[PDB]
Amino acid sequence: AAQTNAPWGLARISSTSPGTSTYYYDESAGQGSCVYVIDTGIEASHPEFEGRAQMVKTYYYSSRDGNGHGTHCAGTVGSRTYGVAKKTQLFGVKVLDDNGSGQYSTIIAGMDFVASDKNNRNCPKGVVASLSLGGGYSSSVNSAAARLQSSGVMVAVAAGNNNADARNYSPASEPSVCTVGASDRYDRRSSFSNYGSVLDIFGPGTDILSTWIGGSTRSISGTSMATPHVAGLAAYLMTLGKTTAASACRYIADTANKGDLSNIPFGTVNLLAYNNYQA
Ligand SMILES: [Ca+2]
Ligand SMILES: [Ca+2]
């Protein structure tokens, strides 16, 4: 399948070179996989989700996304127009408030919730969790991420937006999950993207068009935007049977575009997520 005039990030993950505008993908499109978006919530009623999104847990007064961040990320995972895996099932877990903030205790609870809840869902092709959040180093937060991964869920997390070594941030610094940096449309490391040896992979993160609340759309930037590209890609590859939850991050790194990015510090991987599609 081909989506013409795609958002640049989608086009980029299906090309060996920057500057293309078509997103090439297999028609299976993540059908049968499930992605948990652990964030400010999801506006499930947005036409772009086609009934494939639902809120399953909130830690606040409402399950509504009053912010937009969660809806944007969910859109990059699996919306019709803006999504990597256009037929995946999306589950929202609201661990962040409508200001985009949350306590570590709540974020940890949300991860433990997904590890259990997945056992009640029909996700025959596998389960992914996308975490576009983080803060300063916490061994408890890292441990929760490690547990979620260990339970059989592909965990993708944002590297962070401090232009610093991600070793000082959580859950970015947990080695067992998939830590995602951001790039821009000219194959440069995004100027805000964290780096360091704990990064596993880069994905598109600057000027990313996706869904927003109020049935709208907008373009924003961050490692928060790169992470759902990788989460969606994992769901897509799992549906194709190319990899499993335990090994998806490794497989994505193995099959990445290598050496395409500029402004990568020595010691940080030069790997850009790629779906290796061939018609
Ligand atoms: Ca290339
Ligand atoms: Ca890792």
Curated annotation (Swiss-Prot):
Annotated disulfide bonds: C34-C123, C178-C249
Cofactor(s) for this UniProt protein: Ca(2+)
Binding positions for Ca(2+) 1 per the UniProt entry: P175, V177, D200
Residue stretches in coiled coil: none
GO cellular component terms listed in the entry, alphabetical order: extracellular region
Catalytic-site annotation from UniProt: D39, H69, S224
Residue ranges annotated for the Peptidase S8 domain, each copy included: 7-279
Catalytic reaction equation(s): Hydrolysis of keratin, and of other proteins with subtilisin-like specificity. Hydrolyzes peptide amides
Cofactor-binding details, from the entry: Binds 2 calcium ions per subunit.
GO molecular function: metal ion binding; serine-type endopeptidase activity
Keyword match Metal-binding: yes
Keywords: Calcium, Disulfide bond, Hydrolase, Metal-binding, Protease, Serine protease, Signal, Zymogen
UniProt: Ca(2+) 2 binding residues: T16, D260
A GO biological-process term: proteolysis
EC class name: hydrolase
Protein family according to the UniProt entry: Belongs to the peptidase S8 family.
Function: Hydrolyzes keratin at aromatic and hydrophobic residues.
Protein name: Proteinase K
Organism: Parengyodontium album
Lineage: Eukaryota, Fungi, Dikarya, Ascomycota, Pezizomycotina
Included range, full protein: 106 to 384 of 384
